[PDB]
């Protein structure tokens with residue numbers, strides 16, 4: 016029996032909520048460390064087994080003792096409560112850097128020399144290509160184009176939406192080149208640079224991934240992983256998502272890195288040329304390649320994103336002829352990594368009105384609003400106020416949640432101002448930081464119940480009780496898709512289908528594209544912005 020709360024903290028100007036399992040209202044108090052009450056109220060029912068207490072009106076920063084029944088919790092209120100965790104979430108990307116020295120003065124215990132420095136062989140050939148840099152994808156050391164595109168897009172969108180919040184954090188600054196770009200762009204450039212090396216100069220197509228044939232032991236340090244690197248074949252999905260990300264990067268970097276901006280624009284155009292001359296073939300692992308497939312049978316949303324990205328990059332109305340029929344399809348409007356249509360919708364909506372059809376544009380805005388309404392109804396039913404149903408708690412459920420919060424916030428940039436947007440964002444953070452049935456903070460290195468045993472090779476290699484901080488784990492997954500989950504979590508409700516165990520890859524791994532929406536959402540919460 017405990018209090019469930021945001022274990023990282025609460026914003027002075029933000030909503031403040033705790034949860035408890037109870038069957039009737041109870042008085043609660045918030046007190047100073049000496050013990051004197053500064054706030055008091057009554058809990059109220061929200062369904063399932065749950066009651067909530069609202070202490071939003073407490074505006075004075077500090078560490079308070081929350082008392083309800085015979086239970087106590089320590090809660091922090093601060094002007095920028097999430098600054099440290101946002102910084103850690105962004106530093107994760109630098110911790111994932113491949114082929115670059117990470118010095119101890121930046122990386123502490125996890126400092127290491129440049130890893131995976133060898134040339135990658137193109138599958139089914141004797142040709143070798145240098146594809147250095149960028150990020151290890153997850154708990155493994157593969158670098159995969161499709162999910163990379165999402166992580167880049169999310170960081171770029173965070174820079175575009177919340178630059179002031181991001182300005183207050185510091186990545187591994189000394190590992191990046193001077194002059195230093197704004198934090199999100201400094202970090203994202205490393206991945207963008209690597210992506211550019213994955214494009215085949217002859218055809219404009221993009222290799223699906225570069226990995227070793229198989230996964231090394233969970234125990235393996237990055238610099239000790241010396242198996243041969245293989246470039247898996249060019250794929251439609253990789254080429255299209257590369258196109259979209261590069262087109263996005265072209266726009267965003269224009270005033271910061273003109274050479275990169277220009278390089279990305281032309282790379283995007285060459286990638287789109289490839290799309291036009293090739294079939295929408297889903298990617299499957301070649302024989303002898305057992306690493307992450309990142310497959311996907313539906314590719315029209317990738318074409319949609321690429322098309323809309325180039326529409327916005329160029330501002331040329333000719334692109335709307337291709338975009339608008341794709342926007343009419345009943346594709347899910349989601350934020351990846353496989354279902355990427357909402358990135359395209361956003362690029363379309365963020366293009367000057369003059370370049371697109373007014374009729375189509377209003378239909379797209381209207382669909383977006385209806386989608387958000389649906390998510391808002393979900394959140395209203397849920398005891399923790401998050402836009403989730405039991406069946407949404409799948410592999411990477413934390414990302415499912417964060418993408419949904421992100422959609423609310425993105426919409427505010429294109430004239431769709433849903434009244435639940437900022438409540439949803441706060442509840443998503445609350446949930447991520449311990450306001451859930453397990454009382455689990457789903458980020459390593461933070462909260463009172465942090466993640467301690469992530470499925471992450473650098474963490475497992477160094478200290479299995481003390482992992483790299485700032486890593487957002489996948490979260491509860493009702494499908495029990497690893498040995499540990501099957502054995503330990505059968506019969507538990509959806510939100511309880513998580514275990515902090517290094518072998519539980521289906522509930523407790525990490526990913527660049529799980530940190531990326533988290534950076535966006537937490538940055539939004541820091542940029543406190545009503546009248």
Ligand SMILES: [Ca+2]
Nearest residue numbers: 313316353354
């Ligand atoms: Ca797709």
Ligand SMILES: [Zn+2]
Nearest residue numbers: 113114130131
């Ligand atoms: Zn590496």
